[PDB]
Write a protein that binds this ligand. Structure first.
Ligand SMILES: *Cc1c(COP(=O)(O)O)cnc(C)c1O
Length: 464
């Protein structure tokens, strides 16, 4: 059935369930399918008319290698996307004659990480149950990821989740989503320290091998194969709305750690006809500079109005590097060794050409992003958040061809009201079902920034 191999070539070859629990490989690499499941044009035509859930079952099942029985998989996919307050799950809104926005923000935290998290948490619950295990999920957030994680893992049977965030330094909306979920297996830890301090405590816990063992610790991050896998689906559903497979479709993705756009690459590898895949970056433009020059070189991180894309390095870019080098693990090891030692590497000509043959990249500054929010509101009556506006700006600059362009809208404007207001004067409004959010009771524990204090809290409260 399906096996999973590391980008660094010397880790155990794993089945789906293990790849899901392993996370990062033994050799320091990232897991990828040994081969991609394939869909012919007729097999894609056969998806026409199907619900989001039905397309998800078709597209994702081959990746699970027969390890999750069909009835169980078509409960957990149904339940995952039942949390999205939109019948289409991820609907298109047309913004110009050949341009559409794919709204990934109808889920429980109004942001695109819900798509993968809501299924990942259920798949993990199932795998753990099947092995008679439990897990203690631990992560640090500046606000947004923690919410998505807590809304996904809240109320799962086999996990307890602990998210550390900086006391007094999270936006009101973001904090309330972490702390008012009402679930008994959720623990929001407000650390008397900054985001970097929260990350250091998490790294501390993961380095404490006895602690990890005793608590069955597992991480929240962008590099597990199951944060990426579910995202393949909406490339299919969007492209089917626009006539797949009989015409190719292009996508622009506001991109930070590359997992989103890598899922689009995966869709293409599976047979979805895709013309352009366009990386859209903020002022932290390592990926844009990489496509221009081949020089993936770390520079200082700028704070922008699209903070979820404020990256120094792109955590899943390594997955594309592996594919671009024809799965030459030694080449990938070399480049990553270079990054670690010297802060950059240069991609050689053949793999760089392979990347450029399928991807392009552009950037949007804070002012350009604001200008895009204001013009799209003015011309269409349509309100973008800043991350999504980056996508629209870059899509319009970089699009080439006759294919329809789908721009991924990765957050609701109400998630970043300051930047939206600054750009266009509108104070965005929360969806009606969330209109009470600011009145929900918060419930969180303030802890000092000390590894032993946090470990004791986790030890006391985890059921693991
Ligand atoms: C995480 C995030 C991105 C970047 O996603 P990657 O898969 O890491 O490239 C873009 N926009 C928003 C709103 C996000 O939360």
């Amino acid at each position: 059935s399906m096996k999973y191999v590391s980008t660094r070539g010397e880790a155990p070859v794993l089945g789906f369930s293990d790849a899901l629990l392993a996370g990062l490989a033994r050799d320091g690499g990232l897991y990828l399918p040994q081969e991609y499941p394939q869909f012919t044009a007729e097999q894609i035509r056969a998806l026409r008319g199907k619900s989001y859930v039905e397309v998800a079952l078709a597209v994702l099942t081959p990746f699970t290698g027969g390890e999750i029985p069909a009835a169980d998989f078509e409960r957990m996919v149904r339940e995952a996307y039942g949390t999205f307050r939109h019948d289409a799950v991820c609907p298109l809104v047309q913004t110009d004659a050949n341009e559409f926005v794919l709204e990934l923000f109808h889920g429980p935290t109004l942001a695109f990480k819900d798509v993968a998290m809501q299924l990942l948490a259920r798949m993990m619950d199932y795998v753990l149950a099947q092995r008679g295990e439990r897990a203690t999920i631990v992560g640090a957030t500046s606000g947004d990821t923690g919410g998505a994680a807590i809304e996904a893992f809240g109320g799962r049977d086999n996990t307890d989740i602990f998210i550390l965030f900086p006391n007094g330094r999270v936006s009101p909306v973001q904090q309330r989503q972490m702390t008012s979920s009402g679930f008994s297996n959720v623990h929001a830890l407000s650390i008397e320290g900054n985001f970097d301090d929260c990350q250091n405590l998490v790294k501390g816990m993961f380095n404490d091998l006895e602690f990890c063992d005793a608590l069955s610790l597992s991480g929240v991050n962008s590099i597990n194969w199951a944060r990426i896998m579910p995202q393949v689906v909406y490339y299919f559903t969007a492209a089917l709305s626009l006539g797949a497979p009989d015409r190719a479709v292009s996508f622009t993705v506001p991109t930070g750690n590359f997992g989103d756009i890598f899922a689009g690459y995966v869709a293409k590898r599976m047979g979805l006809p895709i013309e352009q895949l366009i990386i859209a970056t903020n002022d932290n433009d390592i990926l844009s500079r990489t496509l221009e020059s081949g020089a993936y070189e770390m520079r200082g991180v700028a704070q922008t109005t699209s903070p979820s894309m404020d990256i120094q390095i792109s955590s899943n870019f390594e997955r594309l590097l592996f594919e671009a080098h024809g799965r030459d693990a030694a080449a990938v090891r070399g480049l990553m060794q270079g990054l670690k030692q010297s802060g950059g590497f240069t991609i050689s000509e053949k793999p760089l050409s392979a990347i450029r043959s399928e991807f392009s990249a552009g950037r949007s500054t804070v002012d350009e992003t604001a200008a895009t929010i204001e013009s799209v509101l003015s011309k269409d009556g349509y309100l973008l958040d800043p991350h999504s506006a980056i996508g629209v700006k870059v899509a319009r600059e970089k699009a080439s061809g006759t294919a329809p362009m789908v721009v991924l809208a990765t957050a609701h404007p109400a998630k970043f009201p300051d930047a939206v207001k600054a750009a266009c004067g509108v104070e965005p409004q929360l969806p009606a079902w969330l209109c009470d959010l600011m009145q929900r009771k918060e419930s969180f524990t303030v802890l000092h920034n000390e590894l032993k204090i946090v470990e004791e809290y986790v030890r006391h409260h985890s059921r693991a």
